[PDB]
Short mmCIF file of C-alpha atoms in Angstrom, two decimals:
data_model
loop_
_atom_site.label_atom_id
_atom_site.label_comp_id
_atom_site.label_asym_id
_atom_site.label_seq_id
_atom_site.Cartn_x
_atom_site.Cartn_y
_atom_site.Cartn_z
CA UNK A 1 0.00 0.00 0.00
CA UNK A 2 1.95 3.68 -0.99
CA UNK A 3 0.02 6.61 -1.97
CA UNK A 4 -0.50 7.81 -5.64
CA UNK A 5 1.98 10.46 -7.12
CA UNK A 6 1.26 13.71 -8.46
CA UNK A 7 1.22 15.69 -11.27
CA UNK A 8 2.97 18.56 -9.18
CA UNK A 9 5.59 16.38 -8.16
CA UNK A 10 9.06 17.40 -7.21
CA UNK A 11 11.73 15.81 -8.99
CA UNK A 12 13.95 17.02 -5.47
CA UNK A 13 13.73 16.46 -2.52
CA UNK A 14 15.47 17.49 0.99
CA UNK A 15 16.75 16.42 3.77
CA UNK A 16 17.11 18.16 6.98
CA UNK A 17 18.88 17.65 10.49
CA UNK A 18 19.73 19.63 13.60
CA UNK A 19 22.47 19.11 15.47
CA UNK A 20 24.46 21.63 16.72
CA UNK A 21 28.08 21.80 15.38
CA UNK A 22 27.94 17.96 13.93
CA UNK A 23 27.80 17.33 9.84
CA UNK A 24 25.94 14.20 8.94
CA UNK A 25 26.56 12.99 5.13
CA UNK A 26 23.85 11.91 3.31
CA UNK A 27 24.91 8.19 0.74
CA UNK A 28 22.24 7.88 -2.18
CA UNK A 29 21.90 3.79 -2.09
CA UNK A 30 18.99 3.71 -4.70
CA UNK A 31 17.81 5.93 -7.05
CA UNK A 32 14.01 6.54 -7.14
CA UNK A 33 12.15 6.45 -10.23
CA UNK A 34 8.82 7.65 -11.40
CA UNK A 35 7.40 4.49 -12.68
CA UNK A 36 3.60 4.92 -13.96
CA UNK A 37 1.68 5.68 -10.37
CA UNK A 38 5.19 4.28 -7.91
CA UNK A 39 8.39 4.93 -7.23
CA UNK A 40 10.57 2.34 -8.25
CA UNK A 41 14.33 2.00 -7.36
CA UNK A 42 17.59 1.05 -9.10
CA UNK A 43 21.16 0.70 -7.67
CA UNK A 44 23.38 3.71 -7.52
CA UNK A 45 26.24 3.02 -9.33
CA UNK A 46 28.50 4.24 -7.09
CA UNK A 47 27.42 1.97 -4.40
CA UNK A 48 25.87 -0.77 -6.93
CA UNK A 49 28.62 -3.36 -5.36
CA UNK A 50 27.50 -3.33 -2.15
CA UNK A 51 25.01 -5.52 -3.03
CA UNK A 52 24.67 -9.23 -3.51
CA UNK A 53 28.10 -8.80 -1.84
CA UNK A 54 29.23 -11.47 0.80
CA UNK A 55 31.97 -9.48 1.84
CA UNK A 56 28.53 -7.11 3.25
CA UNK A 57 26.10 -9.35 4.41
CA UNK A 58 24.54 -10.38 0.35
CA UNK A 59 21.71 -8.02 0.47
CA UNK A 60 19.45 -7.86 -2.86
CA UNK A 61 18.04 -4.65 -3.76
CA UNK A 62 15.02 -6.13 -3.18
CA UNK A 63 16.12 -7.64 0.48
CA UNK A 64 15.63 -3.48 1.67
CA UNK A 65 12.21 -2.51 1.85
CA UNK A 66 11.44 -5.77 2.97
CA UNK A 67 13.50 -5.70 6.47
CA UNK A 68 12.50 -5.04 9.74
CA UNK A 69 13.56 -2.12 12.38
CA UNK A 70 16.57 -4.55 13.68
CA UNK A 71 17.54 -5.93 10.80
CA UNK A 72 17.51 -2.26 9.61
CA UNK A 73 20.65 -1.35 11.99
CA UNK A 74 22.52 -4.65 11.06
CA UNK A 75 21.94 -3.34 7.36
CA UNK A 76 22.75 -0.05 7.79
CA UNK A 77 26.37 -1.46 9.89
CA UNK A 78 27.44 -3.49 6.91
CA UNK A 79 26.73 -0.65 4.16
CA UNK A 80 28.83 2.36 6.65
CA UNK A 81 31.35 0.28 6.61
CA UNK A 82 31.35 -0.60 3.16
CA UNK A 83 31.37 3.05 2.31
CA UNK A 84 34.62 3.40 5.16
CA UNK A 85 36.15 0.67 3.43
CA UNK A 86 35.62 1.85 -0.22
CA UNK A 87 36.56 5.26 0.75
CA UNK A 88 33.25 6.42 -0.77
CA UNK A 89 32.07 9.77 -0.69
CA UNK A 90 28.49 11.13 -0.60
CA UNK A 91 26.78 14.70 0.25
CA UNK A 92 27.70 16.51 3.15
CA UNK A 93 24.70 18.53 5.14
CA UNK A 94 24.17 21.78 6.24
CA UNK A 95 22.42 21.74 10.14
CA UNK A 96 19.38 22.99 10.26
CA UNK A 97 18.48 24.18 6.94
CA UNK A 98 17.28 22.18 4.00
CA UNK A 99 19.35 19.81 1.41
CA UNK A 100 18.19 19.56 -1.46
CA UNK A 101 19.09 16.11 -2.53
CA UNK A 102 17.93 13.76 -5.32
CA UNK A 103 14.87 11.19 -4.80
CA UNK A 104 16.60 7.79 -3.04
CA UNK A 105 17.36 5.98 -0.54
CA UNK A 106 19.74 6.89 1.57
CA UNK A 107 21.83 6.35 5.12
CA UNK A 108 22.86 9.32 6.72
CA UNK A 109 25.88 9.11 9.15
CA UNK A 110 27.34 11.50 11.60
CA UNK A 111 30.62 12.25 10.06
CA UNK A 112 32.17 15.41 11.64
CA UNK A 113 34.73 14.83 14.33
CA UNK A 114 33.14 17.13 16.89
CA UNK A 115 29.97 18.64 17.86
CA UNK A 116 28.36 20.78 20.64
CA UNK A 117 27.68 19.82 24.09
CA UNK A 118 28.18 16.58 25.72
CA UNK A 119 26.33 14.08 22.69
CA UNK A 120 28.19 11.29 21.25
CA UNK A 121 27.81 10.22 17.66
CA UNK A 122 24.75 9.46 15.95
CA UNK A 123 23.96 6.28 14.66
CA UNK A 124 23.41 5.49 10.85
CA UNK A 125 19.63 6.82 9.69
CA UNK A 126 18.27 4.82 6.97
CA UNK A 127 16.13 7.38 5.02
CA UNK A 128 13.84 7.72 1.93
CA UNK A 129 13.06 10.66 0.07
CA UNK A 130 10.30 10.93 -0.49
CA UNK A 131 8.55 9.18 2.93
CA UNK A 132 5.02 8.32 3.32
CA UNK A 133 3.58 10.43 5.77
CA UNK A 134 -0.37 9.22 6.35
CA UNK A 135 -2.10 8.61 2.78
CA UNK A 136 0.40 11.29 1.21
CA UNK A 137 4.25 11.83 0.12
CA UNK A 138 6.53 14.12 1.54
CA UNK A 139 9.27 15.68 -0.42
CA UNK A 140 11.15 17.76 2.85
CA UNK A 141 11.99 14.83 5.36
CA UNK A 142 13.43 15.76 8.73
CA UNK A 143 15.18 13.14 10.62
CA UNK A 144 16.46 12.76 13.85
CA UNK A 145 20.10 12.34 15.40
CA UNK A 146 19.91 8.44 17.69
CA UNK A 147 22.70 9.51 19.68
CA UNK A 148 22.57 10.22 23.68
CA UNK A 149 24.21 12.24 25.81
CA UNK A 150 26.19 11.43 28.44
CA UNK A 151 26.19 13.67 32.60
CA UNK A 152 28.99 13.22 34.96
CA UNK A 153 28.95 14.66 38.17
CA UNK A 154 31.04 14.53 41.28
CA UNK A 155 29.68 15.30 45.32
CA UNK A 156 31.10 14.97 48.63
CA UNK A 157 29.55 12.42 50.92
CA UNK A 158 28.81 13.65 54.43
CA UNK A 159 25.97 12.76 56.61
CA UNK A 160 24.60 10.74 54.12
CA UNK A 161 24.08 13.44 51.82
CA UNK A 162 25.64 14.65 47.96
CA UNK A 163 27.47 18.10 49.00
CA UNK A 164 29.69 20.35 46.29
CA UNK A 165 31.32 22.30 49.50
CA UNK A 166 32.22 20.61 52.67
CA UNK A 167 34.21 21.85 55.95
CA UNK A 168 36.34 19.89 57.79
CA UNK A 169 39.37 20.01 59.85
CA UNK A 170 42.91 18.73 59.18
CA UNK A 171 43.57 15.30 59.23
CA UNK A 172 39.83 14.50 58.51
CA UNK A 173 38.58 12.62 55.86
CA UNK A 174 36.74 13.88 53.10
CA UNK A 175 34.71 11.11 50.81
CA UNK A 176 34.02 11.30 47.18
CA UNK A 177 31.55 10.37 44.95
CA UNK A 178 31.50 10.46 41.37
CA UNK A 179 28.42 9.27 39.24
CA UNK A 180 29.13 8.92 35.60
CA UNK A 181 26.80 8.01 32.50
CA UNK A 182 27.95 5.15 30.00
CA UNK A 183 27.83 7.02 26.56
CA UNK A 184 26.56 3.80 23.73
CA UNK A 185 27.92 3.30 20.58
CA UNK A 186 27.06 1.83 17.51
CA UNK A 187 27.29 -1.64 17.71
CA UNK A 188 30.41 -2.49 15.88
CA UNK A 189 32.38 0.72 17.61
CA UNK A 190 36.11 0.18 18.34
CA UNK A 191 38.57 1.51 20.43
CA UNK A 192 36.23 3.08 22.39
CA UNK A 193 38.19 5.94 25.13
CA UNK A 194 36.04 6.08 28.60
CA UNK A 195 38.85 7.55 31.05
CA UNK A 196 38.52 9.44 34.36
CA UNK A 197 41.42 11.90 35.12
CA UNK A 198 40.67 13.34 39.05
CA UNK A 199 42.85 16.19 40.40
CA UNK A 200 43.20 16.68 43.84
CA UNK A 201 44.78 20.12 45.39
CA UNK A 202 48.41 20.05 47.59
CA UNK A 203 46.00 20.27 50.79
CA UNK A 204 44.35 16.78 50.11
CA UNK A 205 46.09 12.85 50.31
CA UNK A 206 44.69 10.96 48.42
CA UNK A 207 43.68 7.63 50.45
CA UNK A 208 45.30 5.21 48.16
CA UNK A 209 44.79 2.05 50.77
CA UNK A 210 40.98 2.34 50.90
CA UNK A 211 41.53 3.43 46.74
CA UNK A 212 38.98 3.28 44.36
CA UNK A 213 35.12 1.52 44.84
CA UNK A 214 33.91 1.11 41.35
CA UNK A 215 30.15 -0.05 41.14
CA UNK A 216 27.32 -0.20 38.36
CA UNK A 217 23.89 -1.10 40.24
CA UNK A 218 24.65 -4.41 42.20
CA UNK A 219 28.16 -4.52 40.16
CA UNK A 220 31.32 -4.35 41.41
CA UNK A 221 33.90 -4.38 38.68
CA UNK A 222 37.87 -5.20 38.96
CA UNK A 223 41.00 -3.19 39.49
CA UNK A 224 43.56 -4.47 36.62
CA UNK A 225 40.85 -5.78 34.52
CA UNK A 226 38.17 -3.63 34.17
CA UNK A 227 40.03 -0.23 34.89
CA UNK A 228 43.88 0.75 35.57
CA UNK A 229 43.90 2.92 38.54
CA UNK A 230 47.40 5.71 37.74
CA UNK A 231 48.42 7.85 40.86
CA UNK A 232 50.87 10.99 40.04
CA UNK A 233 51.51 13.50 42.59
CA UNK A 234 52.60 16.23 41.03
CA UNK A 235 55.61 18.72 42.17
CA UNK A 236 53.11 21.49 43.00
CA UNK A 237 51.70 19.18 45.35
CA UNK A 238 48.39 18.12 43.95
CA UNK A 239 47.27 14.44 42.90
CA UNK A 240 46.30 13.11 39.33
CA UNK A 241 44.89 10.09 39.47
CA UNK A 242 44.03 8.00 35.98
CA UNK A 243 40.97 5.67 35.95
CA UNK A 244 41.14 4.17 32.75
CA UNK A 245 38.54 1.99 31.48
CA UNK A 246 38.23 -1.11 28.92
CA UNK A 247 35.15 0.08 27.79
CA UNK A 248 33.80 -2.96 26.30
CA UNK A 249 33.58 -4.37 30.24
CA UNK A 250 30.88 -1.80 31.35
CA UNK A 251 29.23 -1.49 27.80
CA UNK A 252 26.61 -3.71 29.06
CA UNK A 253 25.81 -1.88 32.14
CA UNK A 254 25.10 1.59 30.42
CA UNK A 255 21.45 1.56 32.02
CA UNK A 256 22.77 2.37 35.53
CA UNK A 257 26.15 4.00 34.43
CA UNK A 258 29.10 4.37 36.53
CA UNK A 259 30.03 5.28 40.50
CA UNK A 260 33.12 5.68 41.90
CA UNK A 261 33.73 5.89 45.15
CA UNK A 262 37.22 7.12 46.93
CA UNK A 263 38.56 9.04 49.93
CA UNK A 264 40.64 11.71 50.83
CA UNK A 265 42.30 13.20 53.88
CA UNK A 266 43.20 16.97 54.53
CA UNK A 267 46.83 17.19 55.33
CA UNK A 268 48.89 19.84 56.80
CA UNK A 269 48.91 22.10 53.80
CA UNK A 270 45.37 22.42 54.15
CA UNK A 271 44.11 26.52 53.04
CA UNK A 272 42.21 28.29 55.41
CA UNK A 273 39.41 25.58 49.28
CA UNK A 274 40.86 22.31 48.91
CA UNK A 275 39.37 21.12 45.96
CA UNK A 276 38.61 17.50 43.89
CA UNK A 277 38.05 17.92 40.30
CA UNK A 278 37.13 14.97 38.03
CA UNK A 279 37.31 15.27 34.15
CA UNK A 280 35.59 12.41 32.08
CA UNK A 281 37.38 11.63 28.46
CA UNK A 282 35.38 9.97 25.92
CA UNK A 283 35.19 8.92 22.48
CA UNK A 284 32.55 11.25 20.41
CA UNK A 285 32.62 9.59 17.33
CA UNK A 286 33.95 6.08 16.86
CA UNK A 287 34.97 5.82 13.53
CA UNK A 288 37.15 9.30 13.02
CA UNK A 289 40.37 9.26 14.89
CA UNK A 290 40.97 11.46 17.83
CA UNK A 291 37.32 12.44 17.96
CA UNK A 292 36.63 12.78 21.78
CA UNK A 293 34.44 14.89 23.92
CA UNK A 294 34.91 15.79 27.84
CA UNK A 295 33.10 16.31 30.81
CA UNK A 296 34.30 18.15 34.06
CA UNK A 297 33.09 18.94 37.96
CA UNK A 298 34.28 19.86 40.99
CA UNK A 299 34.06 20.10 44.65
CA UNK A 300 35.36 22.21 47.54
CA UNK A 301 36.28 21.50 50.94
CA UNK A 302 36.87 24.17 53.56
CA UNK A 303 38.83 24.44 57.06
#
């Protein structure tokens, strides 16, 4: 069932995202053809090989239309990287206004290195132009980035409460926690960077033999193999500690994210604030190199 065509009919169509500072690049699979009262489709030539390819998981043109939502993303994995691996090139957007682009089908990726805010890379969109929308056809599509956005944020724990300022005397101890979101990837991401660099000023020691408590719901994950834990005092007298993570060991626990959980004790050089900061490091967009985004807090304790 697909409505009728018209007789005022763009031969054009558009496509349109917004995402603050991110490009997405739009890759024509098929062409769309007029065809009596349908559209019917034939390969682009450019990526005509991608098909009936076993190299790509042997889709047939016809194998498209006729997939499901998840087969959909397994589809639209094998053709992005058929396009990374062919070094093809397709039609870079402008955000937020129209493209005018030709009638197709297409996959739209995120392809700039960086963006605004905190995000993480889109997923592949599989899109046609035009789209059904109720009995009609619609020639200006707007589609939506599937990415998520990551929050970190770091309290003191005192009286069984989250505080950004505490007050304490030397020699006390001062107890951090840091909650963290688990950014997701597409499924076949690589190399993904999820690190934790915490800075500690001169007037704070850093309670190495109590160390780190990393949890994820009822999870408790593993010094050495889930994370490296790297202490450097610096000369100035502050602490940077390193919490590393092998991302593909929390992946799966992204629905309650991270907590870590360490002390501190005010030492002599205490000021009369003595402040932790925490710095999250991830990767924004998993298939450009060096493509990483970063999230900071602090707090401040007082004597």
């Amino acid at each position: 069932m697909t409505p009728s065509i018209s007789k005022d009919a763009p031969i054009k169509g558009s496509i349109t995202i917004s995402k603050k500072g991110a490009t997405f690049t739009a890759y024509k699979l098929l062409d769309a053809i007029k065809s009596g009262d349908a559209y019917e489709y034939s390969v682009n030539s450019d990526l005509k090989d991608f098909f009936n390819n076993s190299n790509y998981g042997s889709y047939s043109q016809e194998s498209i239309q006729k997939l499901n939502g998840e087969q959909v993303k397994e589809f639209a994995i094998n053709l992005h990287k058929y396009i990374l691996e062919n070094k093809k090139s397709g039609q870079e957007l402008k955000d937020g206004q129209k493209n005018t682009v030709d009638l197709g089908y297409y996959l739209v990726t995120e392809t700039s290195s960086d963006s605004e805010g905190a995000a993480v890379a889109s997923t592949p969109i599989i899109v046609s132009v035009p789209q059904v929308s109720g009995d009609s056809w619609n020639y200006d599509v707007t589609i939506n980035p599937k990415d998520n956005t990551p929050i970190l944020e770091k309290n003191i724990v005192k009286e069984n409460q989250r505080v950004k300022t505490s007050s304490e005397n030397i020699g006390d101890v001062v107890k951090y926690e840091v909650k963290a979101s688990i950014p997701v990837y597409q499924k076949n991401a690589q190399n993904i960077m999820y690190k934790f660099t915490d800075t500690m000023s001169k007037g704070l020691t850093y309670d190495e033999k109590t160390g780190f408590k990393v949890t994820s719901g009822d999870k408790v994950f593993a010094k050495d193999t889930d994370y490296t834990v790297d202490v450097k005092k610096q000369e100035d007298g502050s602490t940077v500690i390193t919490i590393n993570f092998v991302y593909e060991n929390i992946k799966a626990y992204a629905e309650t994210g991270i907590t870590l959980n360490y002390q501190a004790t005010l030492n002599k050089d205490a000021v009369i604030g003595n402040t932790n900061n925490i710095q999250l490091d991830y990767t924004n967009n998993p298939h450009v190199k060096d493509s990483y985004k970063k999230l900071t807090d602090k707090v401040t304790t007082y004597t």
